[PDB]
Each structure stands twice: as structure tokens, then as C-alpha cells.
Amino acid sequence: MGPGFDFAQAIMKKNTVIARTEKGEFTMLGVYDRVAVIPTHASVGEIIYINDVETRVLDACALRDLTDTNLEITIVKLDRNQKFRDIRHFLPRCEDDYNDAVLSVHTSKFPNMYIPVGQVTNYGFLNLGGTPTHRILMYNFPTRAGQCGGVVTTTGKVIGIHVGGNGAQGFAAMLLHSYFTD
């Protein structure tokens, strides 16, 4: 509808796949080469389905901060025959608050879904499903089951992936440029 939705669409159309684990179907963001991200509660194993095709997992790392606190981001390297467009230059370098964000989801349940979530707070600490978690972003939208892995963008930045909600607020794990240096 406007330039926020334009940037969100550009990311969804080239940099997302549908990932299926034993824990469900997730929006999965491809970042560069065969490297993608997914919420750690997806419980990625040795094999994952990518757009309904059986795919070997070459590496999977559940990120934690240097205090050994959960970040809820798993970085996955896929045995795929095709690379993602490199979007690392759209990742923030530092923790921040944002205006006017969009949450975008693409699954069998929710195809071509875009949600203007508005202001995004650097919330920090969250007890997420009983697990102490850091680097959480919060937005005041009543997000639902089916949106985990959804991409949070502003114009020109890819800032997080949706990891949970409490019925009134939604929560994303930050994406930082430093997670994807090679």
C-alpha cells in the first residue's frame, strides 16, 4: 500500500522459503549464500523441508549472548542447489528502537500476509515460554500462532524475526549484522 509494504514485499519475494520441522511450518528468512534463520523453538534437526522438498541441514547453531542467555535465533546452512540474494547490508549493526515496522508472513496457513505493527521498542529481557531471552523487540499488535519466523522490516532495514506474543503484544528476536560475518 506504501513504501514500508514495498520493502517488505521485496524481501518476501526473493529472501523467504517455507520451512517445515516436526514442530510446524515457519516463515524462514534467507540472508546470504545457503544461510537462513528460524526461531530456535522450531527445533531444527539433520533434515528439514524447504518449500516441501527434503533438504539436508549442513549446520545449525542456536545463538546465545556472551552471558549464555537464549537469543531465540537459529542460523541454518541448507544443502540447497541455489543461493539467496545477499541482504546482509539491510541488517542493523546495533540494538535500537524503530518506527513504522511491517511483519510479513508466508506459509500454507497465511500466504502473502503483511501487518503494519507500528512502533517497535527495544524491550530487552523477556521470559519467552519459560526461557529467559535477550535482545527482544516488542510491537503492540495481537499476533497469533502461525506468525513465528515472520520478518520484521522498516524501509531499508530487516530488523528481526517474530518469536512470540502474549495476546496483546508481539515479540521478535533482533537480527544484527555481526551474526552473519563470514
Rounded-to-integer distance, Cα 119 and Cα 67, Å: 28
| Set of cell numbers at residue 130 | 519459560
The one catalytic residue in 25, 106, 134, 148 is 148
Q: How many CA atoms lie within 13 A of 106 on its CB side?
A: 19
Rounded-to-integer distance, Cα 79 and Cα 48, Å: 10
Find the angle CA(1)-CA(87)-CA(116) to the nearest 5 degrees.
25
Please state, in angstroms and as integers, the Cα–Cα distance from residue 93 to each residue in 139, 159, 178, following that order: 20, 10, 7
Resolution (A): 1.4
8 Å CB contact between 46 and 57: yes
Q: Catalytic annotation on 94?
A: no
DSSP, residue by residue, 60-81? EEEEE-TTS-EEEEEEEEE--S
8 Å CB contact between 137 and 160: yes
Q: Catalytic annotation on 22?
A: no
Rounded-to-integer distance, Cα 70 and Cα 164, Å: 14
Rounded-to-integer distance, Cα 122 and Cα 116, Å: 17
* Residue among 103, 135, 95 at smallest CA distance from 119: 103
Please state, in angstroms and as integers, the Cα–Cα distance from residue 175 to each residue in 1, 29, 110, following that order: 25, 11, 23
The helix (run of H) or strand (run of E) holding residue 12 is: helix 3-15
Q: For residue 31, is it left (φ>0), alpha (ψ between -120 and 50) or beta?
A: alpha
- Residue 130, C-beta contacts closer than 8 angstroms, at least 6 positions apart: none
The one catalytic residue in 72, 106, 134, 162 is 72
Q: How was this structure determined?
A: X-ray
The one catalytic residue in 41, 106, 134, 162 is 41
| Residue entry with cell 542467555 | 69
Q: Catalytic annotation on 72?
A: yes
Q: How many CA atoms lie within 13 A of 156 on its CB side?
A: 2
Q: What is the 3-state secondary structure (H, E, C) of 100-120?
A: EEEEEECCCCCCCEEEEEEEE
